[PDB]
Amino acid sequence: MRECISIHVGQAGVQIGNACWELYCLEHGIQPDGQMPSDKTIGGGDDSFNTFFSETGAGKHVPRAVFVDLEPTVIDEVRTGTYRQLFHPEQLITGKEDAANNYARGHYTIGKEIIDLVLDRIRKLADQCTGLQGFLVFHSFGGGTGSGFTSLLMERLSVDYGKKSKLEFSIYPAPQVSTAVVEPYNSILTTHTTLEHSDCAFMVDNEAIYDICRRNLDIERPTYTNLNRLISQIVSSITASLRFDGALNVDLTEFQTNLVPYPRIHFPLATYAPVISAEKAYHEQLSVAEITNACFEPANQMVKCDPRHGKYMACCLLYRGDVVPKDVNAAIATIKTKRSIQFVDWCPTGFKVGINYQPPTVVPGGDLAKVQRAVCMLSNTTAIAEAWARLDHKFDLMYAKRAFVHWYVGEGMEEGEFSEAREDMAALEKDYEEVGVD
Amino acid sequence: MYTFVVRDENSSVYAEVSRLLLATGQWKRLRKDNPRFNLMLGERNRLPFGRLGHEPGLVQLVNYYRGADKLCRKASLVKLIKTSPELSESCTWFPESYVIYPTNLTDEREVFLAAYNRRREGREGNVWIAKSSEGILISSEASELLDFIDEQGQVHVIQKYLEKPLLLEPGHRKFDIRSWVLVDHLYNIYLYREGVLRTSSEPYNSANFQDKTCHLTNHCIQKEYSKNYGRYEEGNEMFFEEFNQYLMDALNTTLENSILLQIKHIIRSCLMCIEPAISTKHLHYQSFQLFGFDFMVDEELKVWLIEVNGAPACAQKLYAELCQGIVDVAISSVFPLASIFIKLHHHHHH
Amino acid sequence: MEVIELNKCTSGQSFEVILKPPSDPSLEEIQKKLEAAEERRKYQEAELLKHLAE
Amino acid sequence: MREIVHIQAGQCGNQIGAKFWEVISDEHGIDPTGSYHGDSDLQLERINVYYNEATGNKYVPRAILVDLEPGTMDSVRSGPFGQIFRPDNFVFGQSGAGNNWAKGHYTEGAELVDSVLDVVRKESESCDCLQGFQLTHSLGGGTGSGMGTLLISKIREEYPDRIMNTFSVMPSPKVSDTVVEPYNATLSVHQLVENTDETYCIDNEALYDICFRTLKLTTPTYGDLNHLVSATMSGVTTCLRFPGQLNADLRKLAVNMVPFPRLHFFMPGFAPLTSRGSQQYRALTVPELTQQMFDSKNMMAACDPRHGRYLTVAAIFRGRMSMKEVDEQMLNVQNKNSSYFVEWIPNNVKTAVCDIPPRGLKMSATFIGNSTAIQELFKRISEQFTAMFRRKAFLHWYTGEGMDEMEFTEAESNMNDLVSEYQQYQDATA
């Protein structure tokens, strides 16, 4: 067994973190007060779930989690919420004033006054680890903390834990719920400074989640609560293999091995099916073939883009529920004769499949219906670069006029960081196009 | 009020579509980089497909199909026909073609000659033509056009030149047929009931093959190095009414029976082949596209597809009717306001 | 379509299906960048406080 | 970032400042005594932004009352909520400023400004996390105008890292007849463009037009005008006083609203426009709010929005309504008038909804626009300024307090430069 530490940075990272850890507890039968009746090695153990939870002599199961926000109000409701006895006070780190949606404020100005405190409390978790694999980092692209503090932490974690893997879960900005006009600025700034320090990042475009909640949960105006519970399901499918017995993606290095042949091209696209409304009265359960086919519908992706017009570099199918291999390979045979699935030449056209018999756990009183089988597909397709082109176009529009730039210069940042960051992104768009287009 | 942007000011057809939409009193043109548009009439190169369908509150439509270039560039078409099972190499309506790369830079060059000398083994008609994606050359020896391709720096296609074409009299002269097909967002396939015959003004000559005007039916080369341009038909354009009557008077058949059946068959075959790769049925944006199919009729009234063009122009006395059908069928179907087409569909059972 | 490296357990199964074979800066430089921007802040502030003193 | 310190200066600054405190006291359930007696607990959630908690659950507005003459704040004492203010926060002189910016900035106000900064310090020191300041003043008199901008300059020296926000009343000849008000306003704008982060332009011209033409008040009073100002001040500070996501502190508002440091003069709007007596019997629908808040007739600055382009927009809906409909209608405005929102700032409109409505309304909407059309306002002041200055008329009132001509031509140049920079971005494209 080898431990993973989760780091949740900013409002988006923290609230999504609340959503995941709630889901983890329900999936492992861990109670709000940290007691896990089914765990019979009391006060210790090295089961697969100890990857994410440590134990106390009193029988408490404690997340291997650090929550970090430069302002206190979000993590305060963690300090007072349903899972208050789950987390140690030293896991929940708050400042006084936030980054004001400014990358430079959260990177240079406020980050400096809290970076060493966070590293010390991360060390304290690392000291509890017999064999740490690395980190899962949850953050928004768009906020000042989520973008700017995260990239400072990702630089120092490479320094202090040089051989540990680091995975991101990243919230890509969408105007239907975004909170600031400069979110494209912050996104590119944090992507440029984090690119070399992240082994494998799963991007979630808030636009895609927002329209899934609308179309498939019948939610008129999706809240963060709505969005975060769906994201938690997808995050849980992706981390299930670290927390449960299996043989696919059993450690953080296998994510990179299985999904990232090229190091800079480390953004797998995630697709999830099925998403069914809980108040949908009558519902016909979808088959293995039906949910696998839905993996190739853009309306189910975490990022709207068209993988027909790119190339694949790897594909992983993560099933939960009543699935057996025979039905998977029949579904796959049918799907390839009907759909455009083109791998890059220097890769085998193939799928890595993982099945977990326990179907998805839904939060009681949530919007998601219980289903008998579900799948999360992790595919490294060049089509996801469409999201980079969208972000970069918005950036070019604003930066050409130097709009809002003074807010960043005001915090110590140089104007040149804007254009270094932007030409890193231009290189990244050209890398994707070489790999995925002839 | 619907909104639209224009990004292809060299397009005759969509110049006229733009003009028609304004005259409805229900469409406002924005300036080409305003993102808050309902409709994009886009550029030909690097249309930013990745940016459509991410504007909340706007249904968005664009006049091109992403991926449709695999039908509309000559090397792509060959590879499409040769590799797709529903079109196949077992395909009776596409001339024997081979994609050939300059020596300078897969390629079929030595698989080209195996059939070439197969034609030489029985000394069959072994004349071919090579073209690019003016700019062409017909020969009877591989060497001349083979090197011709290396003498240029980009991939070419070599395809069986149709030695025995159908020639209209008076004139003993070649011609080709252009068909205008509109594919809407639902992937309905609309054949414009008006086609045109781009004709040669010079008698076809079997004996010598670099007489470019008697062999190359293209409108540009005709009103240049030909000096009978316009004698027989106005603008070297025969239209379907006329050509039908020639078919009844001279051949005792009709345009519909001898030619259009095969044309409709080829249009649907090509477009249904690529449909799963370019359909926008469940996409965040929608596409339509006007296509120009080009055919040649041989002497036994067999139709051959010579190529597909993704940004076609129209014939001048036809512009008004076609682009109005575009607005009716492709645009106002998505954006209702306050046939000239034949729908191409066929559901045989087996 | 070959099925490879199949592993079973009580929690589930995993395997691979193939349809087609193949055809960092120091603690020092970092701190040097946080201080450089910090002094750029204090300079910009000093200029304001100078201007206001005028 | 939590506490805001509020300063009101001069006659207008104290009058509208007093009504603001009345209005938002009601919204939060504080009564003249300073006691909470409210039904919801959203009311107390961020009450510490504007109030200090004191003795036995008493709330004291973190408010400082400044004037160079006393009748101002003898009148605030006499007011409905007059006894809610901290009595040591009443700072006042004896001589008045005689509608003379120079007397406010250089002579009479200099005598009094240090003791104002002492109350500011005592209030700033007691703040968990000061976010910055808001000042209410007119720009046409002497105290709020000249001593107000003197204050802003001295606060910035002492708190250079905090946000400075003003509610600044623009003079209009439709309301006042003092000749020198364009001098005072022009000198005032000069200061504001250098030392504030965000200024709400509250035009007396637009207030007059609203009251006279739209509400049919044929003898408008300052009470009619200030009724529109407290509705606006309430609306624009909603996001600071209640829980929410958008523009929830002064700095995040500034980052969202100000693309270039000098262009920080906002055009406020409000719907529905209502008279003081008037007690309307029908709530507006969401589409109605939406079209009214963007209508030129609902702007608190006498500027034609169709004559410029919107750089940034914040919109605040209050009451119980469909967030889906609000979204749909807000999207409609942009997509139906896309030309008026610059294309080189994508998604420059942000929308907040709060469920607690204002007193007397079920549904209301507050607009905050950063439009290049605000240049019309500065152009109007600038024309009245140069008509007198080219003959140096009435300058002796100012040189007699020590001012030089050059100081006037510098203020005039900085203001004409600002108008010029607005024109620049009005003509910029992608």
Ligand SMILES: CCC1=C[C@@H]2CN(C1)Cc1c([nH]c3ccccc13)[C@@](C(=O)OC)(c1cc3c(cc1OC)N(C)[C@@H]1[C@@](O)(C(=O)OC)[C@H](OC(C)=O)[C@]4(CC)C=CCN5CC[C@]31[C@@H]54)C2
């Ligand atoms: C918000 C507080 C305020 C508003 C405004 C002025 N004061 C303070 C009270 C007030 C009003 N009256 C008065 C007569 C004597 C003493 C006091 C008052 C007034 C009023 O309630 O009136 C019935 C009013 C006044 C005016 C005014 C409109 C107006 O309310 C419709 N204008 C645009 C004035 C004129 O300059 C002008 O141009 O009108 C064409 C005006 O000259 C003429 C020919 O009327 C006149 C009329 C005295 C003359 C020159 C300069 N001042 C300023 C604007 C203007 C006025 C209301």
Ligand SMILES: Nc1nc2c(ncn2[C@@H]2O[C@H](COP(=O)(O)OP(=O)(O)OP(=O)(O)O)[C@@H](O)[C@H]2O)c(=O)[nH]1
């Ligand atoms: N999916 C999802 N997105 C969120 C959530 N919270 C914020 N966001 C998105 O993240 C961006 C805003 O960043 P935040 O996470 O709120 O910012 P922050 O890290 O607290 O940084 P500052 O507040 O500027 O210091 C916007 O695009 C939001 O839509 C959330 O709970 N779920």
Ligand SMILES: Nc1nc2c(ncn2[C@@H]2O[C@H](COP(=O)(O)OP(=O)(O)O)[C@@H](O)[C@H]2O)c(=O)[nH]1
């Ligand atoms: N909207 C509004 N404007 C006012 C009020 N009182 C005065 N004014 C305006 O403010 C200017 C006079 O400045 P004033 O505040 O009286 O002078 P000060 O005491 O020296 O600051 C003129 O333009 C008046 O029309 C008020 O209560 N409301």
Ligand SMILES: [Ca+2]
């Ligand atoms: Ca145990």
Ligand SMILES: [Ca+2]
């Ligand atoms: Ca590394």
Ligand SMILES: [Ca+2]
């Ligand atoms: Ca004195």
Ligand SMILES: [Cl-]
């Ligand atoms: Cl290490």
Ligand SMILES: [Mg+2]
């Ligand atoms: Mg925050």
Ligand SMILES: [Mg+2]
């Ligand atoms: Mg007065």
Ligand SMILES: [Mg+2]
């Ligand atoms: Mg003193």
